[PDB]
Design an enzyme around this catalytic site. Structure first.
Site, mmCIF file in Angstrom:
data_model
loop_
_atom_site.group_PDB
_atom_site.id
_atom_site.type_symbol
_atom_site.label_atom_id
_atom_site.label_comp_id
_atom_site.label_asym_id
_atom_site.label_seq_id
_atom_site.Cartn_x
_atom_site.Cartn_y
_atom_site.Cartn_z
ATOM 1 C CG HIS E 133 -55.061 21.182 -20.819
ATOM 2 N ND1 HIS E 133 -56.068 21.298 -21.751
ATOM 3 C CD2 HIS E 133 -53.907 21.439 -21.476
ATOM 4 C CE1 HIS E 133 -55.544 21.604 -22.927
ATOM 5 N NE2 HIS E 133 -54.231 21.698 -22.781
ATOM 6 C CE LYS E 216 -53.574 17.917 -26.355
ATOM 7 N NZ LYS E 216 -52.822 19.005 -25.742
ATOM 8 C CG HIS E 245 -55.581 20.873 -29.705
ATOM 9 N ND1 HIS E 245 -54.995 21.954 -29.077
ATOM 10 C CD2 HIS E 245 -55.922 21.304 -30.945
ATOM 11 C CE1 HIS E 245 -54.987 22.991 -29.898
ATOM 12 N NE2 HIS E 245 -55.544 22.624 -31.037
ATOM 13 C CG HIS E 319 -51.399 27.122 -30.751
ATOM 14 N ND1 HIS E 319 -51.139 25.882 -30.206
ATOM 15 C CD2 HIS E 319 -52.566 27.535 -30.200
ATOM 16 C CE1 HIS E 319 -52.099 25.561 -29.357
ATOM 17 N NE2 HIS E 319 -52.976 26.547 -29.336
ATOM 18 C CG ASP E 359 -54.402 24.943 -22.419
ATOM 19 O OD1 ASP E 359 -53.234 24.562 -22.609
ATOM 20 O OD2 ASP E 359 -55.221 25.083 -23.346
HETATM 21 NI NI NI Z 1 -54.926 22.430 -26.925
HETATM 22 NI NI NI Z 2 -52.874 22.973 -23.989
#
Ligand code: NI
Ligand code: NI
Ligand code: NI
Ligand code: NI
Ligand code: NI
Ligand code: NI
Lengths: 100, 566, 101, 566, 566, 100
Positions: E133, E216, E245, E319, E359
């Site tokens: 990730h 992804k 996701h 985000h 991540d």
């Molecule tokens: Ni994610």
């Molecule tokens: Ni991510």
């Protein structure tokens, strides 16, 4: 902070000066790199304070005396040069025969 | 027109008869010759000599040098002279008088449009150093060494692995290939040493054919008579050098048995004094033989107050010894002797020991080969006065004798003197520029193959290159393709023939070693003494012709606390 | 003890020995200063300098290499010249010779 | 649906009629146009517009852009407009409205699966700067310049050598080749200048054929009429540019003699004010001629309290002058004049001077070209008010006039405007993203040929890229092969033809210069003024049409102490 | 001869029955087997075993290993055993007993002249970690990850751009090509993920054919049923993996609709707990399905006092959400739940969650994957005691279960287990050496493809490699061509077939992914539990078979303040 | 100053020690890196003062005690090694079991 390479480079000079400052405090006679670092840092702070280039060119010759440094050192430093951000931008300060 | 000698010295650097102190030592060199024509010296700057029609001529590039070092004070094994240096196609073109033949007399180094200029007035110029005892424990050593003035590094290793920590060996084809490929990324000329400890010749030939220019015999891999013999036989076949770290334990025999095993064949003995390894306590007697090229590693140079104290723990970590194992500590102690350590300095001064080297991160300091060599010279002058070969009131001969130890002699010992080692015509332009006050300590410019590779550099954003902080930063000669063009990777004749360079896709210039088996003690420049030396088995005292050889430990040394921040 | 100090032997150095020399009176007739270098072909200097150019042909200032002589507006002075050597071929400057002599 | 202009500004950045302060200066720009359709703006994030079937369509890669900069406030010589920017194949694809034509109106920049997104709402986007006075003293200058927002560097040098310290010359074929090879390692587009000081044309043609895109005439190498003429003749032949640093000494003639030697041919005059070099005290009169493209170096910009004081020693070190030699100090002093320094700022404001540059580490600061340009603009607004060309209550025209000085004009002057210089369709995607508060000082993102090459980056181990310490670190566009693909090495048409790239095995993209001889003062965007200018020989006062041109020195400046740690 | 077990442990490391504490945790491992012959252990150093004729034989290079790790304590999914490790041609040759068959018994790993030695006595050796990730926000992440013990990085990105900040996608052919080229410069094996969010299959096939090994699906690009289906169809065709996701907003449906869209096809669910993204509040129920390979990102691991507090702002920045927009903050809050965060730790302990990942810089810490995995193990032992599968008084099974989470399972999930993932014969030699006191925190040596790539290194100028300051510095395996030879760039079968490597001129070793569609939950080593799990829609409580799954937050953790300077 | 790589590297050690020094001052029990940095810097200064290698090998074992550091720390540091420029050049100081 978004530090540019030059700002990061000056951090190296500041730290080298911290080393010298503490040794001078101990009563040691400073060597070549220590002397150059100490005087240089002094000027950088002067610029941060807003002193003029003319004022610093003189003040910088009164930071260290011949009795505070090792033999030969004054002769190894005919002048010291450093730039810093003055209120009116980056300027070069050249201190001739800083150690007398 | 006339000009006083002082004003002249200030303008163009010293001339014939003037003396200069080397750094803060007691060593003084005197200019022996000046190749200029007074009044016709070339100088660069606004309103100066090197300008169109004046000191710069109208020749095409092929008829002039690419770079000229003006008014340089050359210090080399052959002389201490004042002259201009011409560099063309990455090599030393000529040592003489630069300028424009159109209006100037005696010009031997033509300056044209295609010529760059490096002002060397008031500076000392030397050939780049050559360290032959490199442990490739980490790639950072290359920059540390380059900064100190060393431009060629010969050694072995694969990284920080146990074997490399203790020995200068790049074991086998795969590792040899990997390290040759990695070498292209380093700003120094490189030659590798394979593991020479084996009694099957084919295992050695494979390594040489793979690329190594030498084989290291180390006691940690078993320095037995059988291994030594096997390695020397292959060396005689393939024209490569053998470096020896003998049997300290006297497990397979004493020093004389090792000497017998060598059988008169050429061999380079590492750390001949013994602290770094070798038959206890007499490996130092090796310097009496004509086929032995002896070197010293640097921690014992020169003998000082703290030398002995620091050695025990340094020894243990390097060779993976256990301080809890009695036999491990006993054998460490048998290597450290004040007697042989004190004699080593004198033997260098006499020219019985011919080379200095580091033994990088394995009982040696990579950035201190040059520095420590001059400290030994200083201490010997202080203690023994002038050498018998000295003429005039200067230390010119002692200087030539000591500079040969890390320049030409290492190059002769390893068969690369046709490419590097001295400032002579035709050799690769590996040069180091020094301000007299920082000679041997911190250079002003380090040139690799005609391009500046590293130098002290001030504030990048400053109006000039001089403002603080000034510290060593890599230059264009250390960048990508330019680097490949300015460095050499040395290969054995066999590897070169088998097309190893093309197979591994090596990008740097390639040079081949040769003349490793024919070199002998008599060939070491200014260091060919073969003394009738003995070591007392119980007291460890060293004697040459019955005379005790010893010296006193220094309490303070030059080229130390006046220059370093830490 | 001064690190890297010189011990220059006393005396003097004689420059450009064995070469023809000549002295000439020069006068700066311009309103701006003019400075001339040691190796510049004197006969081709700034036109504002008044002197006998014919005599200065193939000559340069007989002063230490790298130095210069300055002429402020209106300044008149006598300078000593020394003849060029080598091939004695003059190229460049104001483009008045561009060949031997 | 309706939304207030403030909430809108906060969400998508300002729109038509909104004003924004440039950093901490008094300069205000007003959005002149907005190419969006209100309600159809593209925004990226969770639950936002750029998602499959919504703001992102179903097109194959060939039918959409590789990168889109959403809601950018463009500041360029042609306008200050709000729009989306599309980048495809490393080049500027279009300036317009991005999105998905399937459901959105007026989409001119299609976004698909193959499209990356850079959120530029609230940011100002400019073309990368172009510095044409680079002294290649050290490779570190490239990163310093890239960080400041300069993406193209034209200059000369071989490293920290005397010649390079003083002049922008890469002397001859060998050095030119080495530097072209080294250029592949630097994250900026590069073009080299050879040594133009010679009276034999062939010596120059060789250099051009080797790779240089221009020739530098510098007084330190002899800026005589013969050398100047020779260089201009070769330039007219090979379509390359000539940069001039004239005869300060007035040794070969006065400014008018130099002007006569040039003979109406196109030439770029470096540091036209004179402090950095040129006929004392009137080289500044050169800006009156149609064939002269005049630039300023940056230490004199703008005139401040400490300007004069710092210049003497800077001058001496750069040009290897001796402070003990009276003539050396007298000629240094004749270059520094408060009169010409004060006028220089006004002449820029009027558009008589067309370019700004650094003169890196040779009387100039490599990371301060952009910054100092805006400080001059600020000081001129403060002192002279609005320009005559200004419309509306904003400084839009002054902004366009000044940004042209380090973007399009330098590109036009050196024949590379077909590749870079402005944000126009078809040009290489060299873009700089700025937060308004740090405009001209510290950029948010520097894009080289479509890839981010450097940007401020926080803690590498952090949960987000924002935690401290945040400092500039190289990104993927500055790495190995990706770098080669995103940078350009400029060559002369001759070098390109002779196959220099293939011979040297240059890995980067190659671009050829052209149109260097046809460019004139009238072509300089917003800076084509040819003033009837004179300089008093005794007092040094500058007059245009008899009016005295002068200004006052600043005591404090914006873009200084509020942003820098040192 | 006899020797006490303590002296033995001190000399050769622990043996069968001895226990070792992992760092400062409460986890203890017990040596299960020892493959040596007591008395015949190989040890390197002066006077030791590995010497000519003794522990080193006479074989040619082809008949011996290039490197041997002596007396290593291996910790892997298959066992915790004491043995020598042989590496040949960059791959794991054998796990057994090293030495010379000429004089030693049971030698399975022959040591010859061509063999380098790494002393691993007293050290623990593991396979290099694999992080799946990775957000390629900056190139510096590679070194940070390598230092932590992670040797393979799978992810997507183009640099610090908005899209990459939020998602692991390298959008389209151009960017994919650029990043593949940039990958050659990084010291870790790399595989890229393209943008899988599109409803036109051809847009996806293009990306796979360009080089990505996976696609992804991220909600920021639209995780709709149509996009998910399209991506899975192409994945089944081209044998590549899909990472998901999901739709946190429940905009297109609830978790069951997404599960329905997947339709039993293999998929890797990122951050399955949900904080990092996914259907609120029940994405965690995904771990019940046989076709789902579930992983956790690292900020929530393990549950501690400060976990909840730090998450809100981390979420927003990652985000591109606006804290002033109510809906933006409400959706951020719906992702952070103490209930699912506390259960996640237990589910790992039970083997319901099979992988751990970072991540990186997008709600995850790149250098903390390994460290946080062991902290979860520690906390679970502390809270739940021994696992049901545990035998003996040690935590051997829990250790094997947790190490599988960042080694073999990630490799199986992405189709690269044929090359890396465990210490098994034939696999690439990516190994990490650890001192027990620093296990999982700061490794002693990181080996990439047979060469040390990074390791802690002391003073470069020191007499030994141990003096301070000691910090991580790149080694030879991370240099130029050596690096290319020791790293792998993973490609899709299609890209490999189309000759992408030759076209882009990729210099590193190439490996192709395969077996991505056939892997299922049952294949996850020691982590194949498919629990009957439910989540209360109002309270968010997690229950497995009706039992509440929960845990307590830690106030203090091991592998934290005792090791780090900041 | 013409700082070589090694001099610059030592500046990193000096700074790490400043961090530890201030935390010790606050009354915190030092961790692994802090302890190593503090003792190391002490020795470097000793060398600048001109103390012998023998003196420092002993003095260095009295900088920090077991009560001033976290549990396990003394055992994580069986010895500390650092080199510095003594009046007689660079020397290696090895302090065995510095924390008791
Ligand atoms: Ni994610
Ligand atoms: Ni991510
Ligand atoms: Ni040895
Ligand atoms: Ni050695
Ligand atoms: Ni200039
Ligand atoms: Ni310049």
């Amino acid at each position: 902070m978004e530090l540019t390479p030059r700002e990061k480079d000056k951090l190296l000079l500041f730290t080298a000066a911290l080393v010298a400052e503490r040794r001078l405090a101990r009563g040691l006679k400073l060597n070549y790199p220590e002397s150059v670092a100490l005087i240089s840092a002094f000027i950088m702070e002067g610029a941060r304070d807003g002193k003029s280039v003319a004022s610093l060119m003189e003040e910088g010759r009164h930071v260290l005396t011949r009795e505070q440094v090792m033999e030969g050192v004054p002769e190894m430093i005919p002048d010291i040069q450093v730039e810093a951000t003055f209120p009116d931008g980056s300027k070069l300060v050249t201190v001739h025969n800083p150690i007398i | 027109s006339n000009i006083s000698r002082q004003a002249y010295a200030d303008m163009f650097g010293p001339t014939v008869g003037d003396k200069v102190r080397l750094a803060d030592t007691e060593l003084w060199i005197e200019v022996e010759d000046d190749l200029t024509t007074y009044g016709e010296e070339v100088k660069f700057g606004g309103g100066k000599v090197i300008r169109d029609g004046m000191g710069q001529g109208q020749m095409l590039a092929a008829d002039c040098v690419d770079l000229v070092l003006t008014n340089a004070l050359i210090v080399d094994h052959w002389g201490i002279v004042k002259a201009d240096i011409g560099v063309k196609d990455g090599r030393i073109f000529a040592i003489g008088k630069a300028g424009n033949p159109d209006i100037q007399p005696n010009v031997t180094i033509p300056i044209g449009a295609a010529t760059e200029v490096i002002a060397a007035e008031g500076k000392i110029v030397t050939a780049g150093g050559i360290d032959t005892h490199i442990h490739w424990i980490c790639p950072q050593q290359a920059e540390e060494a380059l900064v100190s003035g060393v431009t060629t590094m010969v050694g072995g290793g694969t990284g920080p692995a146990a074997g490399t920590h203790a020995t200068t060996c790049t074991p086998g084809p795969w590792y040899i290939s990997r390290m040759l490929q990695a070498a292209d990324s380093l700003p120094v000329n490189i030659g590798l040493l394979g593991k020479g400890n084996v009694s099957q010749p084919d295992a050695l030939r494979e390594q040489v054919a793979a690329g190594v220019i030498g084989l290291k015999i180390n006691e940690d891999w078993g320095a037995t008579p059988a291994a030594i013999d096997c390695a020397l036989t292959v060396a005689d076949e393939m024209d490569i050098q053998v470096a020896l770290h003998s049997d300290t334990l006297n497990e397979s025999g004493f020093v004389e048995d090792t000497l017998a095993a060598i059988g008169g064949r050429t061999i380079h003995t590492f750390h001949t004094e013994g602290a770094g390894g070798g038959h206890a306590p007499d490996i130092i007697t090796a310097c009496a033989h004509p086929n032995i090229l002896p070197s010293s590693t640097n921690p014992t140079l020169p003998y000082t107050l703290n030398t002995i104290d620091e050695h025990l723990d340094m020894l243990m970590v390097c060779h993976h010894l256990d301080p809890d194992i009695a036999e491990d500590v006993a054998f460490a102690e048998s290597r450290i002797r004040r007697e042989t350590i004190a004699a080593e300095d004198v033997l260098h001064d006499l020219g019985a020991f011919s080379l200095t080297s580091s033994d990088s991160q394995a009982m040696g300091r990579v950035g201190e080969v040059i520095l420590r060599t001059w400290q030994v010279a200083h201490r010997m002058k202080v203690q023994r006065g002038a050498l018998a070969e000295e003429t005039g009131d200067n230390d010119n001969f002692r200087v030539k004798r000591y500079i040969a130890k890390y320049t030409i002699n290492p190059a002769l010992t390893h068969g690369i003197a046709h490419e590097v080692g001295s400032i002579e015509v035709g050799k690769l332009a590996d040069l180091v520029v020094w301000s007299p006050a920082f000679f041997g300590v911190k250079p002003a410019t380090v040139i690799k193959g005609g391009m500046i590779a590293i130098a002290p550099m001030g504030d990048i954003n400053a109006s000039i290159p001089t403002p603080q902080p000034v510290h060593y930063r890599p230059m264009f000669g250390a960048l990508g393709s330019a680097r490949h063009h300015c460095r050499l990777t040395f290969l054995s004749q066999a590897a070169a023939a088998n097309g190893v360079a093309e197979r591994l896709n090596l990008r740097s210039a390639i040079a081949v070693v040769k003349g490793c088996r024919t070199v002998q003690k008599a060939d070491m420049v200014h260091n060919s003494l073969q003394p009738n030396i003995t070591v007392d088995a119980q007291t460890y005292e060293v004697r040459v012709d019955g005379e005790l050889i010893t010296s006193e430990p220094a309490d303070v040394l030059p080229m130390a606390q006046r220059y370093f921040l830490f | 003890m001064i690190p890297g100090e010189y011990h220059v032997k006393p005396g003097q150095i004689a420059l450009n020995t064995g070469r023809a020399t000549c002295r000439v009176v020069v006068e700066n007739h311009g309103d701006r200063p003019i400075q001339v270098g040691s190796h510049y072909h004197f006969a081709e200097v700034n036109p504002a300098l008044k002197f006998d150019r014919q005599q200065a042909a193939g000559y340069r200032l007989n002063i230490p290499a790298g130095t210069a002589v300055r002429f402020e507006p209106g300044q008149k002075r006598e300078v000593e010249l020394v003849a060029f050597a080598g091939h004695r071929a003059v190229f460049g400057f104001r483009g008045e010779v561009m060949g031997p002599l």
